[PDB]
Ligand binder design. Structure first.
Ligand SMILES: Nc1nc2c(ncn2[C@@H]2O[C@H](COP(=O)(O)OP(=O)(O)OP(=O)(O)O)[C@@H](O)[C@H]2O)c(=O)[nH]1
Ligand SMILES: Nc1ncnc2c1ncn2[C@@H]1O[C@H](COP(=O)(O)OP(=O)(O)CP(=O)(O)O)[C@@H](O)[C@H]1O
Ligand SMILES: Nc1nc2c(ncn2[C@@H]2O[C@H](COP(=O)(O)OP(=O)(O)O)[C@@H](O)[C@H]2O)c(=O)[nH]1
Ligand SMILES: CNS(=O)(=O)c1ccccc1Cl
Ligand SMILES: [Ca+2]
Ligand SMILES: [Ca+2]
Ligand SMILES: [Ca+2]
Ligand SMILES: [Mg+2]
Ligand SMILES: [Mg+2]
Ligand SMILES: [Mg+2]
Lengths: 54, 425, 438, 344
């Protein structure tokens, strides 16, 4: 039961008590993922317009 | 600002849509001339959803009236609230559709659709952010069925990323104009399976049984049946027309109600339904037991013959929202064998403080139940009883159609039934 | 001094943001017009509150916040609310139609078209910071914007602000206060793409906030207001160390150092006490030992779970009010003898304590009563993994039938990203079990 | 109309409770994966506690105490006794035990040999039993070589024998604990007896030393001679104690049994209680005791998923529904349990 690093100021204080000792995607690849999905929406809407054309 | 464009096609479409704009016009405080005279700011909060604001604080419904013969729309324009509608929004032909899907979809309708779409485009261009469309029609007739589904096909071509919402009256032999209604309904159903996000199925037989049995009305009329549809349409649209912690828009309601693209046909319900013992107060429990009772549903399907995929319930009136939650959780936990167990919390509840006209409180039921397949079974059964003899086919082949197209519609519906069957197990 | 930019995403993020900045201003003595009488350095200064506020030549203290919503209805209340004067328009960004509770829609479809705008607005706040510490991101799991757009914003912040820390305040989906059905999909989607981009995340389960409001405040059916006011008390207690003079949790870096030894396990459990009803006659003020003793009761945890059957990796005790170190140790001793606190063997069995003398400030007319001393415990417990199991299970019930999957593929997402995100959660649950169970 | 699920088809105990629940007309059974349940009869291993108590508007109940495995595992029970100050390593009713890990894997190998060599030097009886397939031997070489997780505990060389027969036996008492943590002891116990005379010379034949119902019904040649199914109930065993020893079962054995149960259950109550949890728990236990010739009782093991004697399936199961289930989900005596009051 030890109290280390006791810091006291005007608005409070802070300390530590030990009971027992122990024992990314680049900006290029995010635009590809986005555009890759925008491309799959374009293709899907095409098959819908092609369907409606028929 | 999330606007909806309303469309009513054909006789049945316009008469139901007519009352609909009469029911909500009263709930929002709009008189027959389009002037507001309510008493609560909540009435105008979401008023622009269905109404356009013209000059002088006038509110003009954002609706398009369509039909291939002037008979019905001359009645609307002379009806109670007929003056409220936009004169231009009346688009109509003279030949009529003769209760023929081919005339409404291929010949007569094909000659008038471009001009109807010219109006739709004018209503959309004025919308700050258009949510989507809603159509009212029947599937057993010629215009709303054939030309209606033609409009939906073309509206989706110009607005591919907008919500298409429809109120479709399903034909029943017990409430029948002509014997070809199975032919027209089987043809339209495939169009809706492809080009709609939500279709509230309204079976004229369920409307009839409700007026006779539960409502105690000797011999009903189409007007009596339409009051029910009005009351229902008023209900399922409370989410959109009034405020609340819900914040529901068309696409959000679809994303939560439709787990599979083609199974977007709902069973609506309403409660109370009292015969004239009408002044009795209705406790929240009673409201809920009836709301789930099959006799209060307009699908003419027994929900105890299928399984619910999702359920939505809207409660209107100043009531105990704590008591609302308790009773809803009771019905689920007393009959969980009728709800699918592979969709968690597939039953939602929205509250509203503004009750319909002349009711302390009410409840509108929206069921996406697999029991609806019984409806498509009946229509398919009646279709085949005639198509197997080519009976009455000349009315259609004389308009340009081949028997092959009828066979496709046959197998299309039978497919749709098999889809509903694999999900009931 | 070093600055902290707050970002609020989606409805839940925006509203919770209101409940916090409303509370921050009451604590720092800032009025709705942005004026602060107690600040003696006019239009400048590097005080402790300056980490969350900037100052104009006219004496206005302006939050370091950016509200982003794909729909304008929820942010529009902020443009006209009681604290409208605090922010300026550039801080409030709103789209025209939301994400329909669809992760794919918030991440790909809509998100792509507004992400550069947000970054530019965020960049405008970064250029005022002399030493930016990082960002605090408030958002929901279930919302299409809260989940879908947040995970994209994080991927880009990690690019445009590499060495800056990013903390989350996430809302766990609870059926009692939500009408959505696909929130499991959205939650597990956003946790997957966001995991490597967040240094520490506090999860709040609305189910937990809900029952605390029904049980302690006697609110039969709580509103979002009741929920947020309470959630901001907890958030205020966690961020207080950054806004007041002190030595514990003095910058965002110290949150990962003191709470997350292993990176992927950065979800600390939060506990708060006391929560007393303002409508109450007059409650017997609790001692430092009674409130501390409450931090180990499941009732007032931000996520219902059983810490007894887990293992602690770290533990902080933030006190506010009439409290002194002598009383803190006394209470702790009494608890280690009664409770079952199993620490992991590769981490010291200890507690860091921070005491702030100013007691918890309460919003006038709010639901909470004024207390003389309160505490909030942050503890990294393997027991919180229960929340993941619950959510992963629901995900599995729907995905087995592929229910609702089409709404996501229809917005450009690949079906494989599901099983990819799900396999990630499966590994996350595994890491937890490797650290706690024997 | 309450609802419950079943996730352990191999449970003979709750198979009857489920039958009784449905026989009341107010309990409805659901599929083993439906979460909308009032009562779960969960699986033995890896029961998903984390998913209980999160369904709005449902008070959920489960028939297992999370963390009870600390008491029903061989090594867990020993470690619990030697570490919990409530019991202490000097506990007087639990055989001197040690935890031993096979050499192909803390471990108390040396601590065992110390007390072993101490005994072997004192002439005292130095016979031990190894278990986790059981081996009884007086040599430390055979016990250790056999294991190559297991536990070695002092074998009771002076166990109480019955007459006529000169045979060993053990005792099984069923204990039920409800959501409130009340400790109810079943008034009816059973003694799984051995049909073979006890022989201390040779521990090779494990048919007269082990009193398992399966071993006696498979490797014993006198199964069912003195009593039906090697099971004597508290009435006959009580009359025997009065005719031969001049004492009763209550004063000589039942007092100690009631004390050991309390000490074990009270010890872990802080760790498993559901007094404030988001769900409620209850579990049936089966304690196994030994009795030496001095009428002192020892604790063998505690079973977390025990079975019941044939003749007592109806009375006990109905009692589980009364004080454990219906006490939380009421329906529309002379309690068959003996409440063991305590300080919570
Ligand atoms: N605690 C709390 N939770 C909220 C609040 N607002 C929404 N939520 C939760 O957030 C979840 C829904 O996500 P939203 O934030 O509403 O959705 P969104 O981020 O705006 O994204 P959209 O789908 O485009 O609307 C539900 O589970 C709600 O319970 C709030 O103010 N406080
Ligand atoms: N130290 C000891 N002294 C005397 N007998 C012992 C003993 N340890 C075990 N036994 C004998 O072994 C039997 C119990 O074995 P144990 O309980 O370890 O295995 P087990 O758990 O598979 C049987 P069950 O679970 O059915 O009670 C008792 O009948 C007892 O006679
Ligand atoms: N509920 C209801 N159904 C109607 C009404 N009018 C017609 N129907 C039904 O609609 C089907 C015929 O469609 P109809 O509207 O007459 O064809 P259309 O005008 O050419 O499009 C028949 O099955 C009728 O029963 C009405 O006012 N209310
Ligand atoms: C069934 N009899 S009826 O209700 O008079 C009716 C018949 C045919 C069409 C419409 C109606 Cl309303
Ligand atoms: Ca013509
Ligand atoms: Ca200053
Ligand atoms: Ca990073
Ligand atoms: Mg007609
Ligand atoms: Mg939103
Ligand atoms: Mg055993």
């Amino acid at each position: 039961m030890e109290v280390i690093e006791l810091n006291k100021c005007t608005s409070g204080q802070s300390f530590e008590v030990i009971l027992k000792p122990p024992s990314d995607p680049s900006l290029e690849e995010i635009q590809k993922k986005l555009e890759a999905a925008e491309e799959r929406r374009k293709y899907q809407e095409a098959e819908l317009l092609k369907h409606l054309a028929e | 600002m999330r606007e909806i464009v309303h469309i009513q096609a054909g006789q049945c479409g316009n008469q139901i849509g007519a009352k609909f704009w009469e029911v909500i016009s009263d709930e929002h405080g709009i008189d027959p001339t389009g002037s507001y005279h309510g008493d609560s700011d909540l009435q105008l909060e979401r008023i622009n959803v269905y109404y356009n604001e013209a000059t002088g604080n006038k509110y003009v419904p954002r609706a398009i009236l369509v039909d291939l013969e002037p008979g019905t729309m001359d009645s609307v324009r002379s009806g109670p609230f007929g003056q409220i509608f936009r004169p231009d929004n009346f688009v109509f032909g003279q030949s009529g559709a003769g209760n023929n899907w081919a005339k409404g979809h291929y010949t007569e309708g094909a000659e008038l659709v471009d001009s109807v779409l010219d109006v739709v485009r004018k209503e959309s261009e004025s919308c700050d952010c258009l949510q989507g469309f809603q159509l009212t029609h029947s599937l057993g007739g010629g215009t709303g069925s054939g030309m209606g589904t033609l409009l939906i096909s073309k509206i989706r071509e110009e607005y591919p990323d907008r919500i298409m919402n429809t109120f479709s009256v399903m034909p029943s032999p017990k409430v029948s104009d002509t014997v070809v209604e199975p032919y027209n309904a089987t043809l339209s159903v495939h169009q809706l399976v492809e080009n709609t996000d939500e279709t509230y199925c309204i079976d004229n037989e369920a409307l009839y049984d409700i007026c006779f049995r539960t409502l105690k009305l000797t011999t009903p009329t189409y007007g009596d049946l339409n009051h029910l549809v009005s009351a229902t349409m008023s209900g399922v649209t409370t989410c959109l027309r009034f405020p609340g912690q819900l914040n529901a828009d068309l696409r959000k309601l679809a994303v939560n109600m439709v787990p599979f693209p083609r199974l977007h046909f709902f069973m609506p319900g309403f409660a109370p339904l009292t015969s004239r013992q009408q002044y009795r107060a209705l406790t929240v429990p009673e409201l809920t037991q009836q709301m789930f009772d099959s006799k209060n549903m307009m699908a003419a399907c027994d929900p105890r013959h299928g399984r619910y995929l999702t359920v939505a319930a809207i409660f209107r009136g100043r009531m105990s929202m704590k008591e609302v939650d308790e009773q809803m959780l009771n019905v689920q936990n007393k009959n969980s064998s009728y709800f699918v167990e592979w969709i968690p919390n597939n039953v939602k509840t929205a509250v509203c403080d503004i009750p319909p006209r002349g009711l302390k409180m009410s409840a509108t039921f929206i069921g996406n139940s697999t029991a609806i397949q019984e409806l498509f079974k009946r229509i398919s059964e009646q279709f085949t009883a005639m198509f197997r003899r080519k009976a009455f086919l000349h009315w259609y082949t004389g308009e340009g159609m081949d028997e092959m197209e009828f066979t496709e519609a046959e197998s299309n519906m039978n497919d749709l039934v098999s889809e509903y069957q694999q999900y009931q197990d | 001094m070093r600055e902290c930019i707050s970002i609020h995403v989606g409805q839940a993020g925006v509203q919770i943001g209101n409940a916090c900045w409303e509370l921050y201003c009451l604590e720092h003595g800032i009025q709705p017009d942005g004026q602060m009488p107690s600040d003696k350095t006019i239009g400048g200064g590097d005080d402790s509150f300056n980490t969350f506020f900037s100052e104009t030549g006219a004496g206005k203290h302006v939050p370091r916040a950016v509200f982003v919503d794909l729909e304008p209805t929820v942010i529009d209340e902020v443009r006209t609310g009681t604290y409208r004067q605090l922010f300026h328009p550039e801080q409030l960004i709103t789209g025209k139609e939301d994400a329909a509770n669809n992760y794919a829609r918030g991440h790909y479809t809509i998100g792509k078209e507004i992400i550069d705008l947000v970054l530019d607005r965020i960049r405008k706040l970064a250029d005022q910071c002399t030493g930016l510490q990082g960002f605090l991101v408030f958002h929901s799991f279930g919302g299409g914007t809260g989940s879908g757009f947040t995970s994209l914003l994080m991927e880009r912040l990690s690019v445009d602000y590499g060495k800056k820390s990013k903390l989350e305040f996430s809302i766990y989906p609870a059926p009692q206060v939500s009408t959505a059905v696909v929130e499991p999909y959205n939650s597990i989607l956003t946790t997957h793409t966001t995991l490597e981009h967040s240094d520490c995340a506090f999860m709040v389960d609305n189910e937990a906030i809900y029952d605390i409001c029904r049980r302690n405040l006697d609110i039969e059916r709580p509103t979002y207001t009741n929920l947020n006011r309470l959630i901001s008390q907890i958030v205020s207690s966690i961020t207080a160390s950054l806004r007041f003079d002190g030595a514990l949790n003095v910058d965002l870096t110290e949150f990962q150092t003191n709470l997350v030894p292993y990176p992927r396990i950065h979800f600390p459990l939060a506990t708060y006490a006391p929560v007393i009803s303002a409508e109450k006659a007059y409650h017997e003020q609790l001692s430092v030992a009674e409130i501390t003793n409450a931090c180990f009761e499941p009732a007032n945890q931000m996520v219902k779970c059983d810490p007894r059957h887990g293992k602690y990796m770290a533990c902080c005790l933030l006190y506010r009010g009439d409290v002194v170190p002598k009383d803190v140790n006394a209470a702790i001793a009494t608890i280690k003898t009664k409770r079952s606190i199993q620490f992991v063997d590769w981490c010291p069995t200890g507690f860091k304590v921070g005491i702030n003398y100013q007691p918890p400030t309460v919003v006038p007319g709010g639901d909470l009563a004024k207390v003389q001393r309160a505490v909030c415990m942050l503890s990294n417990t393997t027991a919180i993994a229960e929340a993941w199991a619950r959510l992963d299970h629901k995900f599995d019930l729907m995905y087995a039938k592929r229910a609702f999957v089409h709404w996501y593929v229809g917005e450009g997402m690949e079906e494989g990203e599901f099983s990819e995100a799900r396999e990630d959660m499966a590994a996350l649950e595994k890491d937890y079990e490797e650290v706690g169970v024997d | 109309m309450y609802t419950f699920v079943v996730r352990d088809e191999n449970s003979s105990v709750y198979a009857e409770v489920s039958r009784l629940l449905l026989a009341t007309g107010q309990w409805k059974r659901l599929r083993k994966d439906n979460p909308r349940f009032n009562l779960m009869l969960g699986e033995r291993n890896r029961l998903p506690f984390g998913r209980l108590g999160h369904e709005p508007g449902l008070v959920q109940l489960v028939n297992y105490y999370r963390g009870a495995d600390k008491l029903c595992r061989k090594a867990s029970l020993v470690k619990l006794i030697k570490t919990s100050p409530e019991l202490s390593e000097s506990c007087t009713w639990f055989p001197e035990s040690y935890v031993i890990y096979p050499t192909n894997l803390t471990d108390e190998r040396e601590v065992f040999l110390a007390a072993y060599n101490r005994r072997r030097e004192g002439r005292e009886g130095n016979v031990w039993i190894a278990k986790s397939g059981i081996l009884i031997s007086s040599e430390a070489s055979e016990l250790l070589d056999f294991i190559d997780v297991h536990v070695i505990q002092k074998y009771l060389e002076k166990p109480l024998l019955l007459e006529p027969g000169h045979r060993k036996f053990d005792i099984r008492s069923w204990v039920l604990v409800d959501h409130l943590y009340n400790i109810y002891l079943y008034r009816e116990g059973v003694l799984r007896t051995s049909s073979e005379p006890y022989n201390s010379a040779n521990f090779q034949d494990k048919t007269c030393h082990l009193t398992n119902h399966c071993i006696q019904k498979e490797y014993s040649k006198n199964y069912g001679r003195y009593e039906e199914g090697n099971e004597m109930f508290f009435e006959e065993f009580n009359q025997y104690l009065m005719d031969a020893l001049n004492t009763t079962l209550e004063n000589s054995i039942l007092l100690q049994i009631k004390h050991i149960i309390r000490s074990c259950l009270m010890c872990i109550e802080p760790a498993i209680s559901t007094k404030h949890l988001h769900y409620q728990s209850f579990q049936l236990f089966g304690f196994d005791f030994m009795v030496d010739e001095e009428l002192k009782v020892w604790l063998i093991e505690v079973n977390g998923a025990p079975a019941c004697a044939q003749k007592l399936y109806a009375e006990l199961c109905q009692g589980i529904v009364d004080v454990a289930i219906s006490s939380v989900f009421p329906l529309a005596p002379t309690s068959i349990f003996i409440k063991l009051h305590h300080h919570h």
